[PDB]
Amino acid sequence: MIKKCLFPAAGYGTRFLPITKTIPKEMLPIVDKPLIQYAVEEAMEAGCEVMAIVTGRNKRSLEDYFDTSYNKENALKSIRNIIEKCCFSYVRQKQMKGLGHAILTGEALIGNEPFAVILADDLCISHDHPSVLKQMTSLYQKYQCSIVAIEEVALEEVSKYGVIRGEWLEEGVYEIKDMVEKPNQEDAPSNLAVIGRYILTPDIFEILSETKPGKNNEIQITDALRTQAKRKRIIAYQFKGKRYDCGSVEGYIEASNAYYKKRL
Amino acid sequence: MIKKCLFPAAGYGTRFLPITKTIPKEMLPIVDKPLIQYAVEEAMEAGCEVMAIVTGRNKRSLEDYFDTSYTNKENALKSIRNIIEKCCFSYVRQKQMKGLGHAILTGEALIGNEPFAVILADDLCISHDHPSVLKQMTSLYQKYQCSIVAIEEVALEEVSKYGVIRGEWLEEGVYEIKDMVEKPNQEDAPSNLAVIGRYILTPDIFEILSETKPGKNNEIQITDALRTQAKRKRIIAYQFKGKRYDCGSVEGYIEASNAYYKKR
Amino acid sequence: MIKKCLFPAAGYGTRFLPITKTIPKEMLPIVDKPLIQYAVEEAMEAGCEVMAIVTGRNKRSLEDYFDTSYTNKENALKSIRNIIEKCCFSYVRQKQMKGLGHAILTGEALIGNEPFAVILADDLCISHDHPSVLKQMTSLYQKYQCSIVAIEEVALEEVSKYGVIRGEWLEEGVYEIKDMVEKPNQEDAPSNLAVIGRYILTPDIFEILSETKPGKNNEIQITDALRTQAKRKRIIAYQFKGKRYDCGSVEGYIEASNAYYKKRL
Amino acid sequence: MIKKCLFPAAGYGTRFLPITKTIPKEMLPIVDKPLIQYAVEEAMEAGCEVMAIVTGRNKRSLEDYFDTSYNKENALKSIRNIIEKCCFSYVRQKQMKGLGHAILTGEALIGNEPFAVILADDLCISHDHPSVLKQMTSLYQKYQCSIVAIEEVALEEVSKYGVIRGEWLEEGVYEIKDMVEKPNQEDAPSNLAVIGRYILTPDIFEILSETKPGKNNEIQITDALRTQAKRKRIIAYQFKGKRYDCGSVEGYIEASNAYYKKR
Ligand SMILES: O=c1ccn([C@@H]2O[C@H](COP(=O)(O)OP(=O)(O)O[C@H]3O[C@H](CO)[C@@H](O)[C@H](O)[C@H]3O)[C@@H](O)[C@H]2O)c(=O)[nH]1
Ligand SMILES: O=c1ccn([C@@H]2O[C@H](COP(=O)(O)OP(=O)(O)O[C@H]3O[C@H](CO)[C@@H](O)[C@H](O)[C@H]3O)[C@@H](O)[C@H]2O)c(=O)[nH]1
Ligand SMILES: O=c1ccn([C@@H]2O[C@H](COP(=O)(O)OP(=O)(O)O[C@H]3O[C@H](CO)[C@@H](O)[C@H](O)[C@H]3O)[C@@H](O)[C@H]2O)c(=O)[nH]1
Ligand SMILES: O=c1ccn([C@@H]2O[C@H](COP(=O)(O)OP(=O)(O)O[C@H]3O[C@H](CO)[C@@H](O)[C@H](O)[C@H]3O)[C@@H](O)[C@H]2O)c(=O)[nH]1
Ligand SMILES: [Mg+2]
Ligand SMILES: [Mg+2]
Ligand SMILES: [Mg+2]
Ligand SMILES: [Mg+2]
Ligand SMILES: [Mg+2]
Ligand SMILES: [Mg+2]
Ligand SMILES: [Mg+2]
Ligand SMILES: [Mg+2]
Ligand SMILES: [Mg+2]
Ligand SMILES: [Mg+2]
Ligand SMILES: [Mg+2]
Ligand SMILES: [Mg+2]
C-alpha cells in the first residue's frame, strides 16, 4: 500500500499572475473548489493517508485550507472529512529549481518508501472508473516499479509536455524506453504525453540528487525517470478518465465551464 | 473630495463554499486577477487614496495580497505593485456577519465624519470608453453633494436578488430616490431599476445605520438605511454607463471569466 | 471623551533581535502577557474604545493576538477576551520605518480630525493606587484642551535616551512646554524632565508632521513636531503618577519581568 | 547517524497564558532569542540536518521564524545560518493528547529510523562540553538503543518530571529498569529526573501506538519508554551542562536573568 502522496505546489504559476503572488496555482478554484482538494480526494480513494505538501513562498493559504476552522454542509462535508482522515505534512522548497528538485525536497517527508505524486494543476475526472491514482495504485501492486500516467494528445500539444517512447506490454501499459521533456513536435518520439500523476520507488531520490538542470534550466523529474528507465523497467499508463490541463489558462476555463454545466 | 473607499469583504460567500472557508469571495480570480483588485483600481481612478477594508474570518489572503512582496510577468505585476506603493490600506474586523449595513457601520472607525465611497467587489464593473463607474459617480457627487447609489435596469425575473428603487427622473441617467426595497419578489418590485455595488455615502448614514434593525434575511441592510436617508432628504440613483457582471453569483462569475478570456 | 488611542508598533526593536524579526517588540511578554495588552487595558481605563495600531512587517502576531480564538485558563484569559469583545481594533501599515513621527502621521487614516491618545507600549506603566497614566492625562485634557505629553524626572545619565523638555511650572506636575529636544547629550539637556511614551495630541499634529523633516537618527520625530506645536500655541507636559519601566531597553525588560515575578509569587 | 530531530511544539503552555494564546511557549524569548532556536543550534551541533516540528493551534509564529525573511548582524547570524542550512518539516497534532502522542504524530516526518527529540522548554547550556544532544549522539554510537537524558534533582522537585530506576553501567550511564511520570515525593524510585532530550529507535512508534493515556490523561513518552525499557535495554544519560526548566516561569525567569548577566 502506497500510504503517502506528495503534492508539489511551490511553482511560480507565472501564468496566473497577479493572483499567484499570494494564492498558489494549486489553490485556484474550479468555481467553488480548489484544484488541490480534488487531488487530495483522489489520493484518498487510492488509499493514501499522508498528504505531503511541498510549498513555496505562498504557503499560508494552502496550509490554512487544510487546517481546522469554524447545501452548505454539502459543500463543506468533503473538506471536513479530508481534514479528519488525513495527516498533512509540509516542507518548503527553498528555491524554484524545477519539479524534480521539488520532489527531491520532498524526501524529508517521504523517506525510504515508494510513493505517489500528484501535480494538482492536472484535474483528472473519471467518476465512472476509479480515480486515476487508484488505477495506478492497483497497477503498482502488480508491477512494483515506478508508474507514469500518459494520455494521447495532438502533436500540436506535445511541446508542452513530457513525451515517452514505450513498448506495449498489455492494454494501455508501456515499458518506457525513453523520455523527453517538452520536445518540438518535429522531435517528439510519439503522441504519448506524460500527465501529473506518478508512483515512484525511492531509488528516485538518489537519482534526483545527481540530475542536472535541463529544459528551462529546471531539474526535471522527466530526466530522473529517463535515467531510472534505463537501469530497470518502469511503466507508462494510459489512464481512463478526463483530464484538463489547468496549469494552462485554456484548460482552467474549460474545466470551470464543464463544472458549471455539471452543476446543472 | 472623496479620498476613502470602504470595501466590505466579510460576508460568507456560501455559494462559493468550500473555497470561501479560507478564500474570501472578493479574492476569487476572474482568471488571473482577484475581484478586489479591479474594484481598487476603479477607486484609484476615481481619486481615492485610502482603501478601507472590512474583514471577516479570512482576511489573511486580502492583507497579504495588498502588502508589498517580491515580459507579462512584468506586465502582469505592474498595476498591483503600483496599487501597493500608491494606496493606503486600512483594516477593521466585522465581529459577526450581521449584514452589509453593519459592515458599513463597523467601517466607521476607518472613515470618520466624511463622505465616502463604498464598493462591493463582487460586482465587477467594466467601462471601456467611459470612466470607471465610481469615477462617473465621483463627478456626479461634485454637483449634488448627497448620497449616490448605482443602478441598472434588469429583467424583472432578476429583481428578487437585489435592492430596488422607485424614483423621479431628474436628468439623463439620474433619479431622486423616493423609496428602496431589498430583494422584492417580482410581484412587488417597485420598478426594474436594480441597485449595484457602488455607493457614495454622506456620513450621517452612520447614525442611521446605528438605529437600523435587521431586515431581509435577518441582516441589517444598507438598503434600509438608504431608504431612511432618502425620506429625510434627497439622495440619488445613477444609471451608470458600463458593463457589470454579478460575480456574487456563479453564473456571473463564469460569464466574467469567459469574457476576460476571449479578450485574451 | 477621547475615544481612539493610536499604538505605534512598526519599529524594528533591534536590541531584541533575532526574535523581533517575527515578533514585534510590543508583543514581547513580561512573563505571560505581551507589553501591548497592558497598554490596551490602560487605554480602556482611560475611556478609549478604538485601538488603532500602526503595523510593520510583524503584523501577524499583533493581529492574531487581538482576534477571537477563545481558574486555570480562565482567570489568565478573562482580561484579553473582555478586551477583544469590547474594543474595536483598526490597522494601517507604516510602509517604511521612517520614525515615530511618520508612524503617527501614517496613523492619520485611522484617526481623522479629532484629538486622540497615543501609547508607546515599550513603556510599561504600573500605577494602580492611582488611575492609569493615560487616564490621568485624559482627565487633564478636559481642563487644558491641548496636547499633553507624559514626563518623568530621570538622572542626567539617562537623559540621552529620551526626548527632554524645557517647561514653565503652571501647577502641580504640569508644565507649559517651551522647548523639546530628542536624545540630547547629557551636557546639552535643557533639563531632567524626560518624555515617556504617552500622549494626547490635537489633530493639527498631522499637518505639522507632514512638513517635519527627518531629525535625530534621520527619522521623523514626534518630538520635533511637538516642539513645533509647542512654539505655536500652548501644549503641556504632565508629570504622571506611577511606576515606569523602559521595556524598550533590555535592562528595563528584565527589571519589569523580575518585578512581575516577585508579585506573581 | 542520526539526521532528524523532532521538536514537539503543540502543548498548551497553560502556564504562560495569555501570550501562549497566540505564541507557542517554545517561541518565548530568553531576552532576544526564542527557546526553539537554542534547541535547533544544539541539534545542529549534534549532526542533525532535518528539523521536524510538531505544531499545534499556533504554528504561524514558529514557521515564520524559520522561514526566509528580509550588532543587528551579530544578532541575525545564527538564525540566518540555521535557515540556510537546515531542512524544516511540519506536521499538525490534532488534539493535545500528550507528549507521547505528539511524538507518534511525528512519525510521518521521521519514518523508520533512529531519531532525536528535543523538548525546547528545557534550555540546556553547555559550557566547555559539547551540546547535550551531541553528547547523546556520541553515546548512541556505542549503545545503539534509546537514550534518555537525566539529571539528579532535589526530592521536592521530583514530582514534575519523569523519574527512572536505573543500574550503573559506567560513568553517568544507567540501564533503565523502570520509569514513572511525575511521582509524588514519597513514591519516587530515585532522584534522577528525565529532561527533554531523547534519542529513540523507531520501534517506539508501534509501542506508542499501543500506549494508553496515563498521567493527566495524556499519552506519555515515559510510559512508552518504560515499556521499551522492560522489553529490552535502553539507557539514561546524566549529561554534563546546565539546564533551566523554562517550562516553569521560575525557570524561565532564572534563565532570562542568567543570560542578562552574561552581558
Ligand atoms: O520548482 C518547482 C517547479 C514546479 N513545481 C510544481 O510542480 C508542478 C508542475 O509544474 P509545472 O511547471 O506546471 O509543470 P509542467 O510544465 O506542466 O510539466 C509537468 O507536468 C506535465 C503534465 O501536466 C508533464 O507532461 C511534464 O512532463 C511535467 O514536467 C506544479 O504543481 C508546480 O507548482 C514545484 O513545486 N517547484
Ligand atoms: O455581513 C456582511 C454581509 C455582507 N458583506 C459584504 O457585503 C457585500 C454584499 O454582500 P452580498 O451578500 O453579496 O449582498 P447582496 O445580496 O448581493 O446584495 C447587495 O448587493 C446587491 C448588488 O450586488 C444589491 O442590489 C443589494 O441591494 C445589496 O444588499 C459583499 O461585498 C460582502 O462581503 C459584509 O462585509 N458583511
Ligand atoms: O518607524 C518607526 C519607528 C518607531 N516606531 C515605534 O515608535 C515607538 C517608539 O520607538 P522607539 O524606537 O522605541 O523610540 P524611543 O527611542 O524610545 O523614543 C521615544 O520614546 C521615548 C520614551 O519611551 C521618548 O522619551 C522619546 O522622545 C520618543 O521618541 C515604538 O512603539 C516603535 O515601534 C514605529 O512604529 N515606526
Ligand atoms: O500534546 C502535547 C503535549 C505536549 N507537547 C510538547 O511536549 C513537550 C513537553 O511538554 P510539557 O508539558 O512541558 O511536559 P512536562 O511536564 O514538562 O514533562 C516532560 O518533560 C519533563 C522534563 O522537562 C520530563 O521530566 C517528563 O518526563 C516529560 O513528560 C513540550 O515541548 C510541549 O509543547 C506537545 O507537543 N503536544
Ligand atoms: Mg508558468
Ligand atoms: Mg503544469
Ligand atoms: Mg494558455
Ligand atoms: Mg451566498
Ligand atoms: Mg452580491
Ligand atoms: Mg448562481
Ligand atoms: Mg532598538
Ligand atoms: Mg523605546
Ligand atoms: Mg540596554
Ligand atoms: Mg502548562
Ligand atoms: Mg516541559
Ligand atoms: Mg512556576
Side-chain angles (χ1 to χ4, degrees), chain D residues 72 85 91 106 160 214 216 219 254:
Chain D
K72 181 194 178 82
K85 284 204 64 184
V91 289
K160 57 179 179 171
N216 306 311
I219 299 177
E254 172 187 358

Side-chain angles (χ1 to χ4, degrees), chain D residues 18-88:
Chain D
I19 199 165
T20 183
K21 152 198 195 294
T22 294
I23 293 177
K25 70 166 183 189
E26 294 68 29
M27 274 300 291
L28 296 172
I30 291 310
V31 171
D32 43 29
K33 228 170 82 173
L35 270 344
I36 191 64
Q37 186 181 313
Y38 278 94
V40 176
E41 309 179 316
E42 176 171 348
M44 286 182 73
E45 165 178 349
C48 298
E49 300 181 286
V50 168
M51 310 299 147
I53 301 184
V54 180
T55 54
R57 203 54 170 158
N58 308 131
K59 70 86 57 65
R60 6 296 289 296
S61 282
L62 228 174
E63 186 177 18
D64 291 8
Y65 193 77
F66 288 112
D67 195 24
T68 301
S69 185
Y70 319 137
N71 276 62
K72 181 194 178 82
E73 198 151 298
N74 271 179
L76 293 171
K77 278 163 57 190
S78 187
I79 184 62
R80 177 179 302 133
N81 178 220
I82 294 168
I83 299 174
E84 294 173 348
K85 284 204 64 184
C86 306
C87 171
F88 290 88

Side-chain angles (χ1 to χ4, degrees), chain A residues 36-51:
Chain A
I36 194 66
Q37 189 181 314
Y38 276 97
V40 176
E41 303 170 319
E42 174 162 358
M44 287 198 78
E45 190 188 322
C48 300
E49 303 181 76
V50 171
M51 312 295 139

